[PDB]
Amino acid sequence: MFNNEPLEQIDKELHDILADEEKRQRETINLIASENLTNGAVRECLGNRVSNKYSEGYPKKRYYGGNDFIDKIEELCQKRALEAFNVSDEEWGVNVQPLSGSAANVQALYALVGVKGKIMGMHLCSGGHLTHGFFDEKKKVSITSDMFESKLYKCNSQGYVDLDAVREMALSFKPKVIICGYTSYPRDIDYQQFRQICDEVNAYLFADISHISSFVACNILNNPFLHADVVTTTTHKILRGPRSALIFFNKKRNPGIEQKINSAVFPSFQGGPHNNKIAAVACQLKEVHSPAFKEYTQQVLLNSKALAKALISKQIDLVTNGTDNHLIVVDLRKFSITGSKLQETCNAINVSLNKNTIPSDVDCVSPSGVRIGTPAMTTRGAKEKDMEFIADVLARAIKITVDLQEQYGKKLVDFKKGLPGNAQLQQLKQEVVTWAGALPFP
């Protein structure tokens, strides 16, 4: 007693929008640093009947029965997880149930510090994530600043984490967790120095490596597992998995942490796990361990260097004047345009990127930068030589943005009337669609 008609027939209206999304993705130069494209196998797992099953609890420790095949799936996933991040089942454990990065962080921070607990994170306007304790002058914007008591550190004038400021605050404010690992940070992290600062205050060291996860697994960037108590990562960004998250925990440094983390996830915060997610992670984490994935991650960094370089050759400024990872933050000051304006211009030419603060920005009000990243385009086949064109396109978009602003004024609503039907943007869009359209597409 059900309807087994294909999606096309049963719900034409939805299928049509979906058919469109797919075309927008196919015909876009996607530079959203946090985005990627899943392969067909990952998507088969996501659409698998394994999500019919309720599986509250942990393997061999379920509330319901008939969970043996589910238990294998979850245990496979924990195993492939620890292997990928080059850690022994004996020193580290992982929880693979968190539905997403924000959930994982909240769950893991609660596990460590409880309600009214003290945490330190990087400010959002400086490149920290919302769940690193974000609050405003007027509001406790993230639960992490409300259920916890948080203090936020900043970057210096050159766009680097000010470790000396981290220390001043940590001794003065006395957190039980210090979070490092960022949403928008173009450079590698000195985890050793974080590990040393925590020790003077007795704090835990939390590394959120969602943006650089593949670099960590592939031994291309600094290893946080060498120093940290907890490591979290989403599975969907550079890692190229489904939308999900991982919590890693150092048993050796902390006996009692395993049950603390597993209990935080369920039953404090979550109910039934989404087993299709757990399955999709398994599928991808296997791909991750292969030398082919190491190729890809290397290719990611090469494109990112070639891109930063090409932009500089076009006299465009970058925060920290470079990148060690997959992401670049462009500084727009020398052109007197905002990131929102350029975001608007890139939107019109099928170039996806986002506005972003620079140190010299007082508030999150008027971002002076844009964040671009190379994982999505690398997946689609772009090589170092293709970074020229992309840089060429962003330079052209910046120039058009500067022209439109002189014509239509400083206010965004005013600025925005220039875009529709602009001969230059339509020519540029066409160049983009034409190049993007024919790129390999999972």
Added chain:
Amino acid sequence: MFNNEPLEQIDKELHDILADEEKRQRETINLIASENLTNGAVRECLGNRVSNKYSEGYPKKRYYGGNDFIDKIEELCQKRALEAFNVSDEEWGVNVQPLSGSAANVQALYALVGVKGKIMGMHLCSGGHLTHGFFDEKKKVSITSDMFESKLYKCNSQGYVDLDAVREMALSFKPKVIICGYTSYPRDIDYQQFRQICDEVNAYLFADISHISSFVACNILNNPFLHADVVTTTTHKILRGPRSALIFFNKKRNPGIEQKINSAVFPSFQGGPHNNKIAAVACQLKEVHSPAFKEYTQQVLLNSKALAKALISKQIDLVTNGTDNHLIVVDLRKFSITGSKLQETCNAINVSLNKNTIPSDVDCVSPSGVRIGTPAMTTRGAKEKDMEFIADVLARAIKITVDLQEQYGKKLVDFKKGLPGNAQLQQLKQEVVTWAGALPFP
């Protein structure tokens, strides 16, 4: 630069376990009251590329661009949602972003009461959910008893919500939220009398209808929307959607609530929505609005009535001696066997059900009942006449459970040893597999 070979070739090891999960599901009599089977269209949406997309914020209020198609998807889902539950765009709003039931409840409760706010829910051992404020002597098990301050009401001696006890407690405790709508409750709910209790204290009325959602939509059971400030529901149980949830909020009774709830979800708790979930939810909600779905939901209740009646005819007791809904709680005291044992016996014969408390239990390690439900089997095509067989199988399992206990003792470790290789269970299993295996299967 990716690997696009089918799941079978790419990760055969996973494909096997998954193929096994599928066979186990097809060959099981599934009586888990919270379980169902999604159609193929819902699973095409779960594995659609729409989840490649970052979409933080709300439609026409996104942080990133390129989100016009996503916006069309999310607005369609809010629209199909409000109508399915027969409420006006103008009086009710809905948030469709919560990743799961537990997240939805925690988010919605946060929105209404804040950190350290007072809430009232049904005890777990009585039939409330974990997120309704559950705690233990010595341990705050759910975040809902830690981030909030909670008190837990119980059912009376006959298995009914003791409304008088609710009032005595509420007036003493002075909560800002009283939650009704339960995990294991075989009877309908008097929302009007709950509305009246809240009014005497000025608390909000929270209705979690995850288990009965279709009944409410189809105008078969009482309407919580008539009386409630907030209604949550999962989309995966009787509603037959993906693993997701909805928060409903009454704007007409509460100006301001719409921002309070939307902001609770993001950016307080969540980051990027899972657009594949949202797409899948939209797809199912369309189906929910057809009269074919009203028929299915009627069939659920008919089956549940027939099953209760058949069990009664076999001299098995039911908490409240019947059901108004999709689920039955069997009281096993007259056979002196625990739910744990029967669950074990049912596991051995491919009959999925779970242990459950009865009023006369006080502790939760001793449960004297089992919960069964009819949505899954109804989906698979079983009609009233089939409920006899299902009752006959359950009676036979109870019988074998009594016999194995007299042979092996009252301790579960010992009891279990009687199960493997038992001539009667293997006989019963085959009858189950042969009937189950051949039933319609989405």
